Antibody, heavy 213, light 212 residues
Framework: VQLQESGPGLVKPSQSLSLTCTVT?????????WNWIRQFPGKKLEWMGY???????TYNPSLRGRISITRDTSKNQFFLQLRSVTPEDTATYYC????????????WGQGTSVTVSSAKTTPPSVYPLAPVCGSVTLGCLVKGYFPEPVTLTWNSGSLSSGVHTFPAVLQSDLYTLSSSVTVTSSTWPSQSITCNVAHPASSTKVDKKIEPR | IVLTQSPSSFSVSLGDRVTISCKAS??????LAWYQQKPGNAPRLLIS???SLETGFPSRFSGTGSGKDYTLSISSLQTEDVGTYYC?????????FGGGTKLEIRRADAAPTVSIFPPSSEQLTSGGASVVCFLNNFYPKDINVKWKIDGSERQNGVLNSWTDQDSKDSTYSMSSTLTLTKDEYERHNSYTCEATHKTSTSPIVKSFNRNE
């Protein structure tokens, strides 16, 4: 009924990728097949395989010899192992259910993003974007981080209307993105504007106060 | 079995009909699913068995087809239908998906609001310089940005990033960032980002001068 993927978000090439799906609300031995599906950066979907409620497995021949799907019935969990990964295994990995008498992928987890890369986890530098000029739009430039993603919160999230988050791009091996916020000319710089930049992979949060001149 | 969707992208006005085709390389006997995927979310089952509408979706959605040929139709497009739609066969293993069809809302034109930002003193101390231009709340998505440094166009070191279509007003926004070294940046005076968009007969310009 409810599925939740977990596991490392960054794996180096040539190593094994291991993920866990924790299932609640339904026993993985009672019915259904329990599947792994992945979505590549270009958004194509690939079914990888399943473990059935009786423990039998079936795998996509595209992954022949490289995949194992196993389970722990005591914890209502099932697992993916993908061996000898390369950067082409970078994808969002989903677990999902199948019922033989229907045939579709009915219930899905939220997905977990895995990056296969030799690049090192690096927290972002946060730089202010303020008008030189000599409504007002401000921003924060979030540069030099790896892997994805980051979240930018303006004034601890209070500031809701008029925030834009631009998707990150790679620049010399590291991600860069920016976020914009637009506020009434009456509130800045009279009231403080701060961006708060969270990078879960490095367990860091950094705040930058926007200053005028 | 290979599943082919045509096309890969659709732009449709609110209230209009959309038709998404899916063709299987073999006969799949109606063992055909459709999924809707919104950004940041898992695919959600929409149609099973070619024609059966899943609970949680309205009758505006309908699946038809037989043999190798299947269609998902939306009779009257609504803003919450924005996303990517995939077909999937479950006739034979390995189960296979079509490549997806991304659906966006065709709304009225909207002109970009442009803002330009010099490199921060903080970034300059590290030896780099990024000049940032935001182009906010425009439609359609097609837009051309040109950077000029002391009046001369620069194309190297420019990175452009568009947001997804905004779920509220159906516009796009984008950042255009020009990255230079500190010494390259500090050798020139004027920095201009110029946007060409169908909402204006002339370029939409924002500039700053280091000598203020």
């Amino acid at each position: 009924v409810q599925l939740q993927e977990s596991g490392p978000g960054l794996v180096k090439p040539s190593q094994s990728l291991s993920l866990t799906c924790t299932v609640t609300g339904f026993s993985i031995t009672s019915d259904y097949a329990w599947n792994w599906i992945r979505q590549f950066p270009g958004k194509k979907l690939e079914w990888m395989g399943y473990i059935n409620f009786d423990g039998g497995t079936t795998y996509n021949p595209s992954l022949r010899g490289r995949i194992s799907i196993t389970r722990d019935t005591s914890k209502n969990q099932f697992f993916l192992q993908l061996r000898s990964v390369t950067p082409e295994d970078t994808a969002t990995y989903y677990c999902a259910t199948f019922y033989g008498a229907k045939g579709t992928l009915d219930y899905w987890g939220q997905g977990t993003s895995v990056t296969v890369s030799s690049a090192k986890t690096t927290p972002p530098s946060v730089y202010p974007l303020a008008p030189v000029c000599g409504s007002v739009t401000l921003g924060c430039l979030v540069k030099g981080y790896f892997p994805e993603p980051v979240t930018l919160t303006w004034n601890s999230g209070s500031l809701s209307s008029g925030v834009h988050t631009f998707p990150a791009v790679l620049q010399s091996d590291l991600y860069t993105l920016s976020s914009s916020v637009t506020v009434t000319s009456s509130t800045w710089p009279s009231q403080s504007i701060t961006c708060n930049v969270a990078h879960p992979a490095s367990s860091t949060k950094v705040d930058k106060k926007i200053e005028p001149r | 079995i290979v599943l082919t969707q045509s096309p890969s992208s659709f732009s449709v006005s609110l209230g209009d009909r959309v038709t998404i085709s899916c063709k299987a390389s073999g006969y799949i006997l109606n063992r055909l699913a459709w999924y809707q995927q919104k950004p940041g979310n898992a695919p959600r089952l929409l149609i099973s068995g070619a024609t059966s509408l899943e609970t949680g979706f309205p009758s505006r959605f309908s699946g038809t087809g037989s043999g190798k040929d299947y269609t998902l139709s939306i009779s009257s497009l609504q803003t919450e239908d924005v996303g990517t739609y995939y077909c999937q066969q479950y006739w034979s293993t390995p189960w296979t998906f079509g490549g997806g069809t991304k659906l966006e809302i065709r709304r009225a034109d909207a002109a970009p609001t442009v803002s330009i930002f010099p490199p921060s003193s903080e970034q300059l101390t590290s030896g780099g310089a990024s000049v940032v231009c935001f182009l906010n709340n425009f439609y359609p998505k097609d837009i051309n940005v040109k950077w000029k440094i002391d009046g001369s166009e620069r194309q190297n070191g420019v990175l452009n990033s568009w947001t997804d279509q905004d779920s509220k007003d159906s516009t796009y926004s984008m950042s255009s960032t020009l990255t230079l070294t500190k010494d390259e940046y500090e050798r020139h005076n004027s920095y201009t980002c110029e946007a060409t968009h169908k909402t204006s007969t002339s370029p939409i310009v924002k500039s700053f001068n280091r000598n203020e």
